[PDB]
Amino acid sequence: RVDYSGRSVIVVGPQLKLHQCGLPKRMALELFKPFLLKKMEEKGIAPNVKAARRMLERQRDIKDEVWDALEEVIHGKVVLLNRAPTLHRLGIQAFQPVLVEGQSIQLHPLVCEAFNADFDGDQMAVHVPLSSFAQAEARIQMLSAHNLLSPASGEPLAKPSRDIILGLYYITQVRKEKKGAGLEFATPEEALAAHERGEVALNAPIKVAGRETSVGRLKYVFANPDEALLAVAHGIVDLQDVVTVRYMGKRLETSPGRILFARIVAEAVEDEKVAWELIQLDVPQEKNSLKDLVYQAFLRLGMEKTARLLDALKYYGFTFSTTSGITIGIDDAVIPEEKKQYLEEADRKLLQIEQAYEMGFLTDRERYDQILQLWTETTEKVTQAVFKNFEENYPFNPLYVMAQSGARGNPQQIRQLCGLRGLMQKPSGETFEVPVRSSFREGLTVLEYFISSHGARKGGADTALRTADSGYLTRKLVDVTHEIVVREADCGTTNYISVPLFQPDEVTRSLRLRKRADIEAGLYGRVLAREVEVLGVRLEEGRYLSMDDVHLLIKAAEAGEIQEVPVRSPLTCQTRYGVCQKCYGYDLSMARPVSIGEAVGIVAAQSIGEPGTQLTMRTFH
Amino acid sequence: AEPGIDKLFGMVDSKYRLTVVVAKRAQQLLRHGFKNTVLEPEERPKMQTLEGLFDDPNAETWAMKELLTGRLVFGENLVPEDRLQKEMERIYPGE
Amino acid sequence: GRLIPAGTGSDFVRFTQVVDQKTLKAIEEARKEAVEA
Amino acid sequence: MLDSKLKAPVFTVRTQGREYGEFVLEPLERGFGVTLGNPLRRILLSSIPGTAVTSVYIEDVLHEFSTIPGVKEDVVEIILNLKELVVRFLNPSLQTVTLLLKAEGPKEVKARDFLPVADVEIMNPDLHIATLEEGGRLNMEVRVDRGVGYVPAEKHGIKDRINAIPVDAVFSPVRRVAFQVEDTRLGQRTDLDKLTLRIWTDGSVTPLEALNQAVEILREHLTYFSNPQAAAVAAPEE
Amino acid sequence: MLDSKLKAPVFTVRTQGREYGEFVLEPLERGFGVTLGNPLRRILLSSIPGTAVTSVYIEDVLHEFSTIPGVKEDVVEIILNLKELVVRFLNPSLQTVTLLLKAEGPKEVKARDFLPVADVEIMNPDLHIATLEEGGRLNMEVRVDRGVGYVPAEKHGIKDRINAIPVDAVFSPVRRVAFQVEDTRLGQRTDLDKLTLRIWTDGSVTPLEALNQAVEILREHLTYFSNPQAA
Amino acid sequence: LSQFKDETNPLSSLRHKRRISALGPGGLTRERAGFDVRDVHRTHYGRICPVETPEGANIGLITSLAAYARVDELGFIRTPYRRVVGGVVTDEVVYMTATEEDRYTIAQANTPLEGNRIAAERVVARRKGEPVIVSPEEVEFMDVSPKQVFSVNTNLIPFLEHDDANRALMGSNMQTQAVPLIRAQAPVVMTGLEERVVRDSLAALYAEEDGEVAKVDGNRIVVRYEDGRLVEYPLRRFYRSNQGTALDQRPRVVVGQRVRKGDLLADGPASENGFLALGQNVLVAIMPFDGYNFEDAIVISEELLKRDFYTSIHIERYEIEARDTKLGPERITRDIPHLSEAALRDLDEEGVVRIGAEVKPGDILVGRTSFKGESEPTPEERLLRSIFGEKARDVKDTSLRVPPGEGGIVVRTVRLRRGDPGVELKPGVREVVRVYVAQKRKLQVGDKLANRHGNKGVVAKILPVEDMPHLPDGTPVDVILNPLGVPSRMNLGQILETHLGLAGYFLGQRYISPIFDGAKEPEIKELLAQAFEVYFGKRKGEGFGVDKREVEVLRRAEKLGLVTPGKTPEEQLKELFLQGKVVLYDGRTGEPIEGPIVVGQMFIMKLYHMVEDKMHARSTGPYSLITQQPLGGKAQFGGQRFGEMEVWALEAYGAAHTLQEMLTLKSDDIEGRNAAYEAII
Ligand SMILES: [Mg+2]
Numbered sequence A: 001r002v003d004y005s006g007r008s009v010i011v012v013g014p015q016l017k018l019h020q021c022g023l024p025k026r027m028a029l030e031l032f033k034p035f036l037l038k039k040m041e042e043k044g045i046a047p048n049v050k051a052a053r054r055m056l057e058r059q060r061d062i063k064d065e066v067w068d069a070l071e072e073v074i075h076g077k078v079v080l081l082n083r084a085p086t087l088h089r090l091g092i093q094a095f096q097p098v099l100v101e102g103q104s105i106q107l108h109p110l111v112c113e114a115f116n117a118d119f120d121g122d123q124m125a126v127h128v129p130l131s132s133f134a135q136a137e138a139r140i141q142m143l144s145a146h147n148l149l150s151p152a153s154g155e156p157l158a159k160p161s162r163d164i165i166l167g168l169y170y171i172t173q174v175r176k177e178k179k180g181a182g183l184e185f186a187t188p189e190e191a192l193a194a195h196e197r198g199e200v201a202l203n204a205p206i207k208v209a210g211r212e213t214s215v216g217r218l219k220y221v222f223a224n225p226d227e228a229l230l231a232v233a234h235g236i237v238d239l240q241d242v243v244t245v246r247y248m249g250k251r252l253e254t255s256p257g258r259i260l261f262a263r264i265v266a267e268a269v270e271d272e273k274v275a276w277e278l279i280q281l282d283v284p285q286e287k288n289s290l291k292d293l294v295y296q297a298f299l300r301l302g303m304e305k306t307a308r309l310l311d312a313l314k315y316y317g318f319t320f321s322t323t324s325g326i327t328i329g330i331d332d333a334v335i336p337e338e339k340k341q342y343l344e345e346a347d348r349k350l351l352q353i354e355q356a357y358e359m360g361f362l363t364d365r366e367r368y369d370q371i372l373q374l375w376t377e378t379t380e381k382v383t384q385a386v387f388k389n390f391e392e393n394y395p396f397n398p399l400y401v402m403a404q405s406g407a408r409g410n411p412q413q414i415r416q417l418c419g420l421r422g423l424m425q426k427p428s429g430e431t432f433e434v435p436v437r438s439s440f441r442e443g444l445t446v447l448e449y450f451i452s453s454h455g456a457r458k459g460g461a462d463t464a465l466r467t468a469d470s471g472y473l474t475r476k477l478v479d480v481t482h483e484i485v486v487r488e489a490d491c492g493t494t495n496y497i498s499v500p501l502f503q504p505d506e507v508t509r510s511l512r513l514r515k516r517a518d519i520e521a522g523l524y525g526r527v528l529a530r531e532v533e534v535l536g537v538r539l540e541e542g543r544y545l546s547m548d549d550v551h552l553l554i555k556a557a558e559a560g561e562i563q564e565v566p567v568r569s570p571l572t573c574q575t576r577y578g579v580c581q582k583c584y585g586y587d588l589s590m591a592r593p594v595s596i597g598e599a600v601g602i603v604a605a606q607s608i609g610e611p612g613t614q615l616t617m618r619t620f621h
Numbered sequence B: 001a002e003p004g005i006d007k008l009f010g011m012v013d014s015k016y017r018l019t020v021v022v023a024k025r026a027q028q029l030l031r032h033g034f035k036n037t038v039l040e041p042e043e044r045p046k047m048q049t050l051e052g053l054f055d056d057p058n059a060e061t062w063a064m065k066e067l068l069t070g071r072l073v074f075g076e077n078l079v080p081e082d083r084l085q086k087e088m089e090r091i092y093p094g095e
Numbered sequence C: 001g002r003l004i005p006a007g008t009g010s011d012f013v014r015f016t017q018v019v020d021q022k023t024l025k026a027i028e029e030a031r032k033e034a035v036e037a
Numbered sequence D: 001m002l003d004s005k006l007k008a009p010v011f012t013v014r015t016q017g018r019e020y021g022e023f024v025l026e027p028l029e030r031g032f033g034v035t036l037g038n039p040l041r042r043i044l045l046s047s048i049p050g051t052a053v054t055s056v057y058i059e060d061v062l063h064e065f066s067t068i069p070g071v072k073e074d075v076v077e078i079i080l081n082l083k084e085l086v087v088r089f090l091n092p093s094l095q096t097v098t099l100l101l102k103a104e105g106p107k108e109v110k111a112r113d114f115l116p117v118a119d120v121e122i123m124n125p126d127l128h129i130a131t132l133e134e135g136g137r138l139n140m141e142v143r144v145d146r147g148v149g150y151v152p153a154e155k156h157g158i159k160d161r162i163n164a165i166p167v168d169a170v171f172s173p174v175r176r177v178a179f180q181v182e183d184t185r186l187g188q189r190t191d192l193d194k195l196t197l198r199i200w201t202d203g204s205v206t207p208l209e210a211l212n213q214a215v216e217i218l219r220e221h222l223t224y225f226s227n228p229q230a231a232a233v234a235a236p237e238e
Numbered sequence E: 001m002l003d004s005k006l007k008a009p010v011f012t013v014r015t016q017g018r019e020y021g022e023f024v025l026e027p028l029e030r031g032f033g034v035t036l037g038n039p040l041r042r043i044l045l046s047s048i049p050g051t052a053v054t055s056v057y058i059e060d061v062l063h064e065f066s067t068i069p070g071v072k073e074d075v076v077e078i079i080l081n082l083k084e085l086v087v088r089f090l091n092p093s094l095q096t097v098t099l100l101l102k103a104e105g106p107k108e109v110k111a112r113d114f115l116p117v118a119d120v121e122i123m124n125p126d127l128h129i130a131t132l133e134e135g136g137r138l139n140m141e142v143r144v145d146r147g148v149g150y151v152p153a154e155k156h157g158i159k160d161r162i163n164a165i166p167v168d169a170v171f172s173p174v175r176r177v178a179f180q181v182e183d184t185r186l187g188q189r190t191d192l193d194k195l196t197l198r199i200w201t202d203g204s205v206t207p208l209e210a211l212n213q214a215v216e217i218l219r220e221h222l223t224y225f226s227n228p229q230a231a
Numbered sequence F: 001l002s003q004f005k006d007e008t009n010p011l012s013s014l015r016h017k018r019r020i021s022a023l024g025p026g027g028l029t030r031e032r033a034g035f036d037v038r039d040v041h042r043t044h045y046g047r048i049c050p051v052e053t054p055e056g057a058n059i060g061l062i063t064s065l066a067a068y069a070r071v072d073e074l075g076f077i078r079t080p081y082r083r084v085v086g087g088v089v090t091d092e093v094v095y096m097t098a099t100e101e102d103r104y105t106i107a108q109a110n111t112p113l114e115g116n117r118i119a120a121e122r123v124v125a126r127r128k129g130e131p132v133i134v135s136p137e138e139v140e141f142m143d144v145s146p147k148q149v150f151s152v153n154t155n156l157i158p159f160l161e162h163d164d165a166n167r168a169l170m171g172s173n174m175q176t177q178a179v180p181l182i183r184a185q186a187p188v189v190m191t192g193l194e195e196r197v198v199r200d201s202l203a204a205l206y207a208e209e210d211g212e213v214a215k216v217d218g219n220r221i222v223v224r225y226e227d228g229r230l231v232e233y234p235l236r237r238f239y240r241s242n243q244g245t246a247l248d249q250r251p252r253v254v255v256g257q258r259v260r261k262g263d264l265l266a267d268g269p270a271s272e273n274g275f276l277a278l279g280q281n282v283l284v285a286i287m288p289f290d291g292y293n294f295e296d297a298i299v300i301s302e303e304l305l306k307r308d309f310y311t312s313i314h315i316e317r318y319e320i321e322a323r324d325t326k327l328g329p330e331r332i333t334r335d336i337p338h339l340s341e342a343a344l345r346d347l348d349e350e351g352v353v354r355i356g357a358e359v360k361p362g363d364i365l366v367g368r369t370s371f372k373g374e375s376e377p378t379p380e381e382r383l384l385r386s387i388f389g390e391k392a393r394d395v396k397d398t399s400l401r402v403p404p405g406e407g408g409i410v411v412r413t414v415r416l417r418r419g420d421p422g423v424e425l426k427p428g429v430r431e432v433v434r435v436y437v438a439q440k441r442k443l444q445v446g447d448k449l450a451n452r453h454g455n456k457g458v459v460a461k462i463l464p465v466e467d468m469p470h471l472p473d474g475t476p477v478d479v480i481l482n483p484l485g486v487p488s489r490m491n492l493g494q495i496l497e498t499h500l501g502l503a504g505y506f507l508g509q510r511y512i513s514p515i516f517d518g519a520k521e522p523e524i525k526e527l528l529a530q531a532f533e534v535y536f537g538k539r540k541g542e543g544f545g546v547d548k549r550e551v552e553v554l555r556r557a558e559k560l561g562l563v564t565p566g567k568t569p570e571e572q573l574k575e576l577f578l579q580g581k582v583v584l585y586d587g588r589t590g591e592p593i594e595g596p597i598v599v600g601q602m603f604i605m606k607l608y609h610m611v612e613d614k615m616h617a618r619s620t621g622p623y624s625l626i627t628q629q630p631l632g633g634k635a636q637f638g639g640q641r642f643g644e645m646e647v648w649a650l651e652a653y654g655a656a657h658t659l660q661e662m663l664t665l666k667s668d669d670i671e672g673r674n675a676a677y678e679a680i681i
């Protein structure tokens, strides 16, 4: 148990900058009491400490000046927040508190993912680094805003999350209007003429005498960004309409939306130039593209300046989603017209199966197998249709938008809302040959509902069979790796490993380029063990393999110019109970070489352990 | 973030050395009032309360400001272990 | 109960010293009292 | 206390040149950041009086989407370069002015090269319009007009010369407005608003001036709730 | 002749009760319907001073969670009922009053049963307060204060009588506020705004009165913009 | 197997009594027989609820008995099925066990009837657990009702068939934790059960015979029965549940009122006119709001607070023992030794606090003095005292104080003494004192709200009404639910609840919509059409057309393909209202929210707050005698637990000193913690 600590229910703090958190003053006052008592003595608000302490025993005797003495005690000082179970390093992070009314800890939204906190009533514990030294650790190495990339994968971790994406996606989208088809004419104003008498759409995919265009593009031609945005504000064009804007000498065809986004970045990073060459301007911003935007920002500008961009994206993302007007009505779970047919065609293919069985061409299992085989294919063809439908017809539909932006939901879930639940499995493991035809919109049958509850358990049970503890694995791992720390700078070993870029045994023993991730996971932030001259460029021995360096190698392997990469690994490192800095490579959480003295075994155990909790357990198919 | 974290990092060979240097400079920056400070008047840390910007009491901070000016020196084996705890008490009273 | 052998507890880092430019007149204290009379 | 009433809030301004200003007003009672912020913002963007180019004559080009020989830019680009020209009328009576410019050959063309007319003076004399080299020549009748906000070219009628191409006219001299309201404290109160308000002008008007006259348009509009005119209340009819 | 601006709009009211009012202002410059309607509705809903019950002392009760004999309601229920009481301070220099009410025997106590006080009118004299059966006696003092906004009982130490019960105050006499902005023209000018406010109140304050005050507040706020300061 | 009755509300108790454990003297948690036992068996159909179960590590071990299910004399659960003979369906009902059932071809209940006649060509049936389609000739029994498949709690979830099961579990669980409000409402959309639950839960008080009301006050009701009998019903008043929530019957009846047998008289704690009232009905707009509803978090109009809308009354009990000592007796007394008088104000009453006092944290509930410290005063304090007119009294202030984190207002003190009245006290105790302290908990940031479809969140923001999104008629909304909480949860039931609720809000009606039966899209849409007439129909009559903003929105709305092009502004608006979406104005800006927003009435419950989950903070306090680790006092929190899991996080950070000081200074190291304090001071 621990002396300067507390616990409370957490609530989101959208107002907080990334390194701040909201602490109830009532709780701050206890945690810092001894410190507080001293300031009280340094100020004309208490003679001595005993009398100051007595001031604080009863709530009614607490004055005003006291709370001003707190805001001063707290100054600089940070605290730690912890949400159990601490599954990895980021289970504890340090913020500098901001005193709030009420009795809830206020948590920045960007740190929820790592804490795996959500606001259905999770509580965080708070801890207070007392000493000059512990405060420095907390501030330099534990502060939220200094831990933006994951130490397991080296990918950003404090990244746009939900409503934040949603917002930003909706503005960087562009509408696709269909009431203009692909007509052509003696363009000039004869184009807009059509548009005027309601004939063409404005974002219609016209292809006039010459080139392809909006309407649209030739109608609205802004000399600068803020002319474009003065326009949208005047309601004479939406951020989603595609338009013509002269930006940075270049004459562009985008939406005012996409410009505005581009501005947001530019201003957040104090650099109009670098901004414009980090951004993917010709696609809608989404979970992934933003992720990559952050990562780049992080490499190119500081980490300090990256946190500024992060809060910037947060801020707008949030506000843009509010006015966006996304919700969910029942009519948003859109059932594709195709479902009738796929099910009618399924049902008749099923007649044929049942016939060939009743004759005796089918063994009991052969029929059973064949039915499942069918309902599988069908569940797919339906899921396919659902999405195809959303893309062609209702591409700004909230369910679709949420799922695509990565803001929330997957195709399995969307299928269950609009298509059909499909096959459910028996308590015994096997599958019911009758699938659930209803979507959650249609609403299940009492039998359909029971049938499908069997898997419900298996779920709930196999979660709560690790969601109590699978930190069972991480225990096992720490126990074997805890002693390992980056001890030297270089152990000076000659040997190494050779990371392959090819998988055998596809067409039994045939070679095949490994997946980009699988390679990135093998190569990023490794030190090159021997020189590697590839694609007319020599990568030098002892070089830390940057992310771009990796894509290069992948590019070179696609051009059939390399097959393995010699790479210094901890597998072959010669440091005694530990690992040298060259053999480990990059930090990962910071995208530079690991610093000597990192507890790199513990970081390894957590990295492997943490995901274990979400590894669908016993063999079920 | 902290004002100058990236460049503070750039000043050392191990992440952890920074923290050490900072802590230790904070310890002495407290031990001798704030008299040691290598920060000229106008560049001293500041607060706001009771309405009158007094010097920022947080020494964890102070040290980080001073580092960034480069008026400090840090090293593994500089001066002897006790020719320091008295020699620093000469220029600034231990009281 | 000991300081862990990693991070700010690793030997590579632990024993670092810090001194101001003015306190660096400690090496002049050796330089002004070495040879006697 | 409850409290009594409230402090009369301090109004701060920092002003970087004649083109940008930040305006902080704190503290305000709960909600008043937004209550002030928004009206002033829409006033600033829609209703502050300014000037801009409305339509343009060019001696040797019929369509607006053509290009001209001897002048390396598009017709459209030149129009775009004009949409950025900022002028000011130092006479209250002036409503419309057609500015003259004429030059050709191996020379670069700024804004200043516009012939000096009436009580009209160009704010940005170093504004780039066009480059020229050989043979190609340029003569025009650039028509300015006093207005508000943003008026597109298709949205205004009754055309000019027999060769008149309408221009989208950014009348408003406030290029952008942006405000954020943030929580502030006064004693036990954590609930109070502090209003930060950032304004960009083209520089024909001070950012602070724009504001001065923004508040006014609101202030004056509030005196319209003045001359009550009676009317019958509608029947329930149920 | 300067057609740049437009003639001052007609401001026409349409008011009957003490309770409801419509307020029109046409024609306004495009957009101006919102530029005006909104800030006013905010000031209206939030910031108009009213009157409300602040504390209740009752003869033989000690606290809010008691129950009077011969009386159907709990003390909690009775306060809830007293929150609905709306009163005018005919005198504008009057900050507070205490209404008295002694009742007895089989009867149904409503808000007119209160002992009458000079310069103080009860806008809802029919509002039910308690039901009293045989031998049930209710004897109470009710404090009414003038105030603004929402001020909860835990936020006042109303210690006149040591057995009083402090009550949450909902001062605002503005009860609901909508505004319409509709298309209107003036000759060739097509998209001009016609602003229409709709103000419901409790009766202690009038829609128009509320509207005037709300304007005056906004007026007195645009005051704070002149008289600057360097950064 | 015997446990603290869960009576957070009526249903809590009902559900508690109907539970079924696999633990005790039967095989438990150690063995855990994972994935078996914890698992809904084909035979659970109608015998055990397949959804009501504890989430977490008790999953499938404790379980709830299904609504119509019944336990026979041999101890087997039976379920009613109606006998069907030749496609006609008799009302002759049979209670089969699991094995009897397996002998039959039983058809589902939704099976279309044409009188008693099975109307359908093909019929869905279970043949010993096996879903099959059969012709009606082959049917031998039929389900009574979807109701039978599920527990009581689950049966309380309307539109259940539209909610994924995992989230309906959370729904039927949270209802248990619903705290009784003082302005409780029965839901706008109900299922059926809500009345009959209160009946059985013995929450409310009903009249046992035909009669006329004689007397009624908050305290009791007297009823003259048609035979002459005058029976008095004491109205259990402001009493304390196991869980501290209040139960108190209020009279819902007037003097001289005629009353049938089984008519209502008093409402329970959580009933509104004998219908279970576990929460409020409240206007909800489902749309994101500036991040304040970011991750299941919920925003709240201050208007709720003003209407006393989520206000509950909680009673805490405090005890103090006056014990005989080896050192000699200690006493309850007004006369404690110290430096205060204003600290005795509302005490006087011979030690004990006056009934009716406002008590803050740290205040004196009961005054008590013990002989202390083996009765030695410090030679150092000996002097200190004689400088001030020494007394140096033997007895110490061991007075009972309101712990931090609040008390409230005193309502009853109870005194039990030296065995003599009819009391068996703990041996060594002279007497005990009890003080009961009541508090009207209003809604506040942190409180946790829930609907019955397992959407659960924490109030993260309270906005002033001016900031709240409002309909065009100037009606603001009460709560703002984030839509992102729906697609992955697949609890579409709440969306339907909202649509019907919107119609209800304008047509001034409530609904009963049976589980797997009830309202269906086209029927809701018809009601929404009627409602539209109120919500809009009148606008023209009161002299108003469509708002310029209403037009703005529709323009965007037709490009989303929600509304038909060409159709008039008004008729587009109806189209939109039929999807249960309205045009919402942002109270901050006055502008509309681009594209329409689903609003409507939703039933939401404030959830019980446990002491363990209350807000905690330690600076420095008591410590364990044996291990010398921070230990929780009476009015002093214990410390947080620092586990090896947290120790790793710190190690992985290289925060060496922090870890050290965490496990020495801030815990174990004895002089460490003192020198630490003294230093800081
Ligand atoms: Mg959770």
Ligand SMILES: [Mg+2]
Binding pocket: A218, A219, A220, A221, D153, D168
């Ligand atoms: Mg154009």
Ligand SMILES: [Zn+2]
Binding pocket: A490, A491, A492, A493, A572, A573, A574, A575, A579, A580, A581, A582, A583, A584
């Ligand atoms: Zn090595």
